[PDB]
Amino acid sequence: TLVTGSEYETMLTEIMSMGYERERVVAALRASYNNPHRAVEYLLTGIPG
Numbered sequence: 001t002l003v004t005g006s007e008y009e010t011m012l013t014e015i016m017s018m019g020y021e022r023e024r025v026v027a028a029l030r031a032s033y034n035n036p037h038r039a040v041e042y043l044l045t046g047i048p049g
Contacts (some may be wrong), residue, residue: 003034011036015043 013041015025020043031047
């Protein structure tokens with residue numbers, strides 16, 4: 001499964017609604033390979049390492 005670009009954008013804006021700035025959410029989605037659960041985990045408690 002490959003999300004579409006519009007699905008990516010709604011995933012990004014949805015996580016941004018928590019209060020996170022756009023660029024940080026973009027980086028977290030890259031770190032998590034577009035898994036929103038890992039991305040939010042990274043935004044809450046840090047990226048791996």
